Structures are given as C-alpha cells and as structure tokens.
C-alpha cells in the first residue's frame, strides 16, 4: 500500500491486458509512424459500405438502409465490449473485488461511460476517430453530417478530446486516472463509502506522484486533470438526453440489455 510506484505498475500492467488498443498504439496509427498500413477511411455511405465487413458484428442477420442507424447499431456493439473491458480492468484494481457486490455494480454503473469517453480521446484527433481496434478511421465530418439527432452524438466527444489530448497523458497516466474514476465514493446509492474512499485515496496519491514524475514540466497537471472529470459528466448528461430523443422519435431502436440496465435510473 505504501509503494505508489508498485500500484502504478500493477494498474498499467492490467490496463495493457484489458484494453487491446492503447493510446501509444493509437498515436502511432494516427501519425502514420507504424509499420502497418493506413486505416480504412469511412467518410460517406459508400466508404462505410466498403469497410462495413471489417466492423465486428454478430446478430440475427442487411440491418438497414439508413446510414445513421447503421452507425448507431455498430457503435452500440463497441460500447458493449468497452463496458466488458472496463469491468475486466475494474476487477484488477486492488480492493475492488473485496467491496460489496452491490457497490461494485454501482461504481460500474456510473463510471463506465466516463471512462469510455476518456479513452475515446486516445483514439481521436481533430479530424476523426479510430474504429475496429485501429483498422478503420471514421471522420468527424461524416459523423456530424448524419441526420438529426444522430449527427449530434459524436461532436461533443471530439470537442472534449481536443482539449483533453492537449494534456498529453500517456497510458501509464490514464491507467491510474480511470481507476480513480471508478472508485468514486460519491456515486448515488453506495452502501459503504468509507472503504471506497480509502482505495481512492491511494489511487489519487499514486496519480499525483505519477503525473509529477512523468510530466515534471507540467505544473498543476493533477489539478487540471481532476477538472476534466467535470467535462466528462456533461458529456454523459448530454448523451442521455440525446438517447431520449432517439427513444421518443425513432422506431425499433431498442438498446442492448446491458446499456439499458446502465442508463436505467441513472441520475
């Protein structure tokens, strides 16, 4: 417990095991400084249709004529695996699986989407986002050109990512930061806050030491990163409202059971 560097290395090792596409690998792809070929670029209906079969997708069947609904369906497949990846990482945070099972669920329910939007920034530049484990690249303009309300989903995530990426965090930093987010003692409905705060205290101490060592020139980086937590909550809040426009005005679009459970009675 006393060694903060051992905690940082443990979290980083688990981070590498749980998340196939790290920021380091994503930056190597986005800057072309990698041995592998450039990603397939999806910028319109035709380029989506041409790269569609490389998008991971297992269902009953051909899903739809509409581009917006095609992306909506494929993005929710990714979100499901992201929750599964974050759950796997959460079980490696020291002390997490010793917590009440109901509190583990609660911490996941409120934490996963803040983590999803954090790690999306690793896959984004000002012009697009990497998809399918870096094999493809879907442009920001294309996502914004989708008919309402579909064109409004990704744009706030891009705006957050440009400012968040300016902090120049790396995978070692992000591994501790996402653990800090999961171990939030102020999530609604937590039964035993004190043991959760005890874990977050060490994670916060490890994060502060990690940022001072890895960014000795970035004064008050710890404070700037904690303030980004408030940006992530607006994204969640705005995203839930966008999902409700979908739920009231679009037809057949029922979310995956796991996503429905997370959003149900959320805030």
């Amino acid at each position: 417990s006393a060694d903060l560097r051992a905690l940082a290395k443990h979290l980083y090792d688990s981070y590498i095991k749980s998340f196939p596409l790290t920021k380091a690998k994503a930056r190597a792809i986005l800057t072309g400084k990698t041995t592998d070929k450039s990603p397939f670029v999806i910028y319109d209906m035709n380029s989506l249709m041409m790269g569609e079969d490389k998008i991971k997708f297992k269902h009953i069947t051909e899903q739809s004529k509409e581009v917006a609904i095609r992306i909506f369906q494929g993005c929710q497949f990714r979100s499901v695996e992201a929750v599964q990846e974050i759950t796997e990482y959460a079980k490696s945070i020291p002390g997490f699986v010793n917590l009440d099972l109901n509190d583990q669920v609660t911490l996941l329910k409120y934490g996963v989407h803040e983590i999803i939007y954090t790690m999306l920034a690793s896959l984004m530049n000002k012009d697009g986002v990497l998809i399918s484990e870096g094999q493809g690249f879907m442009t920001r303009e294309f996502l914004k050109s989708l008919r309402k309300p579909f064109g409004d989903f990704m744009e706030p995530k891009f705006e957050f990512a440009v400012k968040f990426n300016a902090l120049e965090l790396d995978d070692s930093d992000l591994a501790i930061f996402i653990a800090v987010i999961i171990l939030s003692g102020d999530r609604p409905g937590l039964l035993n806050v004190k043991p959760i705060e005890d874990i977050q205290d060490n994670l916060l101490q490890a994060l502060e030491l990690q940022l001072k060592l890895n960014h000795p020139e970035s004064s008050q980086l710890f404070a700037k990163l904690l303030q980004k937590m408030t940006d992530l909550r607006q994204i969640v809040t705005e995203h839930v409202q966008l999902l409700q426009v979908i739920k009231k005005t679009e037809t057949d679009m029922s979310l995956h059971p796991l996503l429905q459970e997370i959003y149900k009675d959320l805030y």
Partner: peptide, 10 residues
Amino acid sequence: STLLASLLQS
C-alpha cells in the same frame, strides 16, 4: 436485471 453483476462474477 443483474447483467453488470454477471460480468463481475467470473
């Protein structure tokens, strides 16, 4: 439902 708890219990 208890889907989140299912991913937890491995």
